[model samples]
Target: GDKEECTVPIGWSEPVKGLCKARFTRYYCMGNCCKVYEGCYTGGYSRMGECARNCPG
Candidate 1:
């Protein structure tokens, strides 16, 4: 099972308030859910997830 993990894992900057949030998440749906999954991963900067709102980003 996957757990809720928050972080700011590099290459992903928080536009509002500098913190370890608003980072990217890995759904690993064959890379279908990855935000930057353009058929490949450069720097592995995937910026997409299936949760969170009204929160810092």
Candidate 2:
């Protein structure tokens, strides 16, 4: 069975430490992996756009 789904946390942002003011870092797709049979999946990059591009359907 090839039932696998992969995803990335795109559009997600987090605050960065060590700064005078508040700052956020956008997330991107680094990579992802999915399992078969049960439809299990997991993963991303530096930006949302890239994450979406790397995400599998």
Overall lDDT per candidate, in order of appearance? 0.32, 0.39
Query: Candidate 2, which ten residues in sequence have the lowest lDDT sum?
Result: 34-43
TM accuracy, model 2: 0.27
Q: Using lDDT as the measure, which candidate wins?
A: 2
Q: Name the regions of candidate 1 deviating beyond 4 angstroms.
A: 1-3, 16-53
Q: In model 2, where do residues sit more than 4 Å from their true spots?
A: 1-20, 33-47, 55-57
* Angstrom error at residue 49, model 2: 2.8
- Put down candidate 1 lDDT per residue, 1-57, tens digits, no spaces: 754444435565422222443443332222112333232223333333332222222
Clashes of each: 0, 8
